[PDB]
């Protein structure tokens, strides 16, 4: 069975487009965003999210992750695609080779 060609259309690497489409009818385009900002402000206002040293280690590792992704993402995607293309080319070559061998026989 062949795989699809694209994934699930995530936004910001965290939330899929299905959520934005699901809130589009009742709360429009800014609905999900005001829900997100409201939840963030309620979390860090009622001190559900306690600001500590882990906030800054979190910001550091998230910055390193976003930078590393934006930088070495094209390279890793192209590397995987080229690995698959080389394997496919080698396989097609080795199939035609045996066809030619039996035709020669």
């Amino acid at each position: 069975p062949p795989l699809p060609e694209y994934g699930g259309k995530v936004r910001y690497g965290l939330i899929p487009e299905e959520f934005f489409q699901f809130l589009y009818p009742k709360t429009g385009v800014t609905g999900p965003y005001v829900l997100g900002t409201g939840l963030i402000l309620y979390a860090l206002s009622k001190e559900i999210y306690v600001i500590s040293a882990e906030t800054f280690t979190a910001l550091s590792v998230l910055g390193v992750m976003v930078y590393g992704i934006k930088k070495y993402g094209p390279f890793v995607a192209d590397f995987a695609d080229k690995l698959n293309e080389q394997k496919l080319a080698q396989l097609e070559e080795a199939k035609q080779a045996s066809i030619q061998h039996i035709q020669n026989a």
Binding site: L3, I51, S52, A53, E54, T55, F56, T57, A58, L59, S60, V61, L62, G63, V64, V76, A77, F79, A80, D81, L83, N84, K87, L88, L91
Partner: protein
């Protein structure tokens, strides 16, 4: 207060450490296909490179541990990397898990060396061309070395990972304590924290590789 991130986590009273230790293999999906997605492609390339690195130096009997040593390095590296995310509990900071990883493998290698190989196993404690009046001393040394190899394995992982985390946390506190004071100094401390984060990624991978390489050498000295 300071070692709060190394205490066995519990959610609603249950040992979440079990889930945290079982999670790493979930990030390695496998497939029967011949040409598959980018994640499995990159992971299989990495596993092949790792196997060729760790296992080419062994003979036919040491190469039966390819599964064991590749599993060890993959498990430790993924645990150490997942320990870098915010608020996470890293099980490789625990001396219990690291002792349970180190003692079985080292003991298995030395018992494998004493079951077969027994002549060469007992000869290994003496270097080849050791002069005569020094033969006793170099047997007291080498012996205790062979007896600290397991502990010095586990500790070397624990003491490292723990320490790294501690340092980062402390620097984090610094930034927080400096957020209400001069902001250029806060940005300088934050840049130190970013460099430390990159160093901690490197040390995660390096510690996985070194634990596995020392186990591999103990195996190579007994096959």
């Amino acid at each position: 207060n300071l070692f709060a991130s190394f205490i066995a986590p519990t959610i609603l009273g249950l040992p979440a450490a079990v889930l945290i230790i079982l999670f790493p293999p979930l990030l390695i999906p496998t497939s029967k296909y011949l040409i598959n997605n980018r994640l499995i492609t990159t992971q299989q390339w990495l596993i092949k490179l790792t196997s060729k690195q760790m296992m080419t130096m062994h003979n036919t009997k040491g190469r039966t541990w390819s599964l064991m040593l590749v599993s060890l390095i993959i498990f430790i590296a993924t645990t150490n990397l997942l320990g870098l995310l915010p608020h996470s509990f890293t099980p490789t900071t625990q001396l219990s898990m690291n002792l349970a990883m180190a003692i079985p493998l080292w003991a298995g290698t030395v018992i494998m060396g004493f079951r077969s190989k027994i002549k060469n196993a007992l000869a290994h404690f003496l270097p080849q061309g050791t002069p005569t009046p020094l033969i006793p001393m170099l047997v007291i040394i080498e012996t205790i070395s062979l007896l600290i190899q397991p502990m010095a394995l586990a500790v070397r992982l624990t003491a490292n990972i723990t320490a790294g985390h501690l340092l980062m946390h402390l620097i984090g506190s610094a930034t927080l304590a400096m957020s209400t004071i001069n902001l250029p100094s806060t940005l300088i401390i934050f840049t130190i924290l970013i460099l430390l984060t990159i160093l901690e990624i490197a040390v995660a991978l390096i510690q996985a590789y070194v634990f596995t390489l020392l186990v591999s050498l103990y195996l190579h000295d007994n096959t």
